[PDB]
Each structure stands twice: as C-alpha cells, then as structure tokens.
Amino acid sequence: HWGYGKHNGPEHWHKDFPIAKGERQSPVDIDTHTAKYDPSLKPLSVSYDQATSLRILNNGHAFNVEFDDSQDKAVLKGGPLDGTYRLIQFHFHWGSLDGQGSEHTVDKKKYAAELHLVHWNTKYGDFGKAVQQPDGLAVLGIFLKVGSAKPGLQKVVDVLDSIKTKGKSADFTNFDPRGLLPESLDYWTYPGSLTTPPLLECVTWIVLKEPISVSSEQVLKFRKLNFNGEGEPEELMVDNWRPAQPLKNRQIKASFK
Numbered sequence: 001h002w003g004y005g006k007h008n009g010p011e012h013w014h015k016d017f018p019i020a021k022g023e024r025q026s027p028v029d030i031d032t033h034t035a036k037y038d039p040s041l042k043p044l045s046v047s048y049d050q051a052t053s054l055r056i057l058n059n060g061h062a063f064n065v066e067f068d069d070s071q072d073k074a075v076l077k078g079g080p081l082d083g084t085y086r087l088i089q090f091h092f093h094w095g096s097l098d099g100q101g102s103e104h105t106v107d108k109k110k111y112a113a114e115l116h117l118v119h120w121n122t123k124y125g126d127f128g129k130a131v132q133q134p135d136g137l138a139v140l141g142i143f144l145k146v147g148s149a150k151p152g153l154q155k156v157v158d159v160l161d162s163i164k165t166k167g168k169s170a171d172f173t174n175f176d177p178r179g180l181l182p183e184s185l186d187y188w189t190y191p192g193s194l195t196t197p198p199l200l201e202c203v204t205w206i207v208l209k210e211p212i213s214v215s216s217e218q219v220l221k222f223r224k225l226n227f228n229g230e231g232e233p234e235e236l237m238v239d240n241w242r243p244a245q246p247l248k249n250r251q252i253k254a255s256f257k
C-alpha cells in the first residue's frame with residue numbers, strides 16, 4: 001500500500017488514486033509575490049478554549065492527536081470560510097534533515113516540519129461525509145522552523161516514546177492546542193486537497209505566514225518514531241511529506257499586505 005518510500009511514495013499514488021493528478025491538489029508552493037491581498041478576507045476566528053483532546057495515535061504515516069468533535073468545542077470560522085468547522089485532529093509532516101519536511105513551501109523554501117489542524121464543516125454532520133464535499137474541510141497549516149523550543153509542543157514530544165510503532169495509541173487528554181499557534185494569524189488561502197491518499201479535493205487550505213520555532217531536540221524526537229509495526233523491521237518515520245503540486249487554475253489569496 002501507499003507510503004513515502006521509493007516504491008510506494010508520492011510518484012506512485014496516482015495509480016490507486018487518480019485524483020493525484022487533479023485540478024486542485026495540495027500542497028503547493030506559495031509564491032509570495034504572486035499571491036494577492038484580498039481586503040475582503042475576514043480575520044480568522046480560532047476558538048480552542050473548550051478543546052477536548054482524547055488520544056494520540058501512530059497510524060503508520062504520522063501521529064494524530066484526536067479531539068472530541070461530537071460538539072462545537074474547538075472550532076474554526078471566519079477567514080475565507082462560511083460556517084463552522086470542528087477540530088477533529090492535528091498531525092505533522094517532517095523531514096530527515098532540518099532543511100526539508102514541510103508540504104507547502106514559501107517561495108520554494110522548505111521548513112523543517114508542518115502542522116496540520118484538521119477541521120470539518122458541521123453542515124455535513126460527520127467527517128466522512130465532509131471529505132466528499134468541495135467545502136468539507138478547513139486545514140490550518142503552520143510551518144515549523146528549528147530554533148528555540150516551543151513549550152506548548154513538549155507534552156506531545158514527551159508521549160512519543162509510548163506510540164513508537166504503527167497502531168499504538170495513548171491517552172492524551174487535557175492538551176491545549178492554543179500552545180501550538182504563532183502570535184499572528186495572518187494567512188494565505190487556496191482551495192486544495194488532502195495531501196495523503198485518498199487525496200480528496202475537499203480542503204480549504206489556510207496557511208499561516210508566521211512559523212513557530214521548535215528546538216532541534218523536539219524535532220529529533222519526531223524522527224525516532226517508526227512507520228512500521230512492533231516486531232517489524234525498523235523504518236524511521238521521517239520525510240512523510242508530499243512535494244508541491246502544480247497550482248493549475250488557482251490563485252492564492254493573502255489576508256495581509
């Protein structure tokens with residue numbers, strides 16, 4: 001099945017998921033000079049004060065921190081969005097080296113990692129219905145650069161030893177995702193897709209301009225995770241990113257000048 005290796009990686013995905021060559025695939029390069037300020041774009045509304053984290057899971061491609069999305073507890077609204085999108089999970093993509101790892105790029109620059117806070121449009125009732133809709137998901141993307149530690153990330157780092165291999169999960173309650181956000185909510189936005197199979201074209205991407213800084217020790221601990229299951233040959237979970245895809249008939253909009 002699909003993964004990030006030589007023989008099952010992004011260049012192969014189109015054989016099982018032809019939408020890989022579709023008209024609104026993600027990620028993309030964000031050409032900052034070509035993005036257009038849209039003065040009518042509203043500020044983002046990130047309402048995470050009542051967020052209820054439940055569990056962290058190594059799913060063999062990344063780790064997901066999962067939330068209770070059975071009520072409007074942690075929601076994203078405003079910006080380019082109409083309606084209310086509920087936080088279901090967050091996860092990261094990262095590199096084997098500090099100079100690669102992000103999915104989106106900025107003027108072709110790659111960051112060490114990229115955080116995806118995944119939200120679904122409540123008008124569709126559940127996440128599985130939402131992914132079948134062009135406006136089903138809103139994913140808030142945040143770049144990570146290596147420098148100072150991010151204190152709000154440490155609880156995540158601390159638990160990774162307990163979910164080293166594919167299929168392992170751990171309780172992960174009372175985690176506050178507000179601790180993962182940069183100061184500014186200035187963003188770029190465009191219509192795109194899931195960046196892993198099934199690559200569905202259901203995402204409004206909202207990518208923050210300001211990266212967060214994480215320490216070298218923090219990202220080193222991401223790189224100690226495994227793609228494999230327990231008792232299988234060890235394959236370090238690194239370079240779990242899809243490269244930039246063609247922009248095609250899309251314009252990236254900026255919330256800021």
Ligand SMILES: NS(=O)(=O)c1c(F)c(F)c(-n2cc(CC3CCCCC3)nn2)c(F)c1F
Pocket residue numbers: 116118127128131139193194195196197198199
């Ligand atoms: N990196 S990302 O764009 O933010 C990103 C995500 F946030 C995802 F949640 C998924 N994801 C995994 C499933 C399983 C089922 C696929 C279809 C039926 C319901 C769910 N669906 N969506 C995904 F593939 C992805 F690429």
Ligand SMILES: [Zn+2]
Pocket residue numbers: 091092093116195
């Ligand atoms: Zn992702």
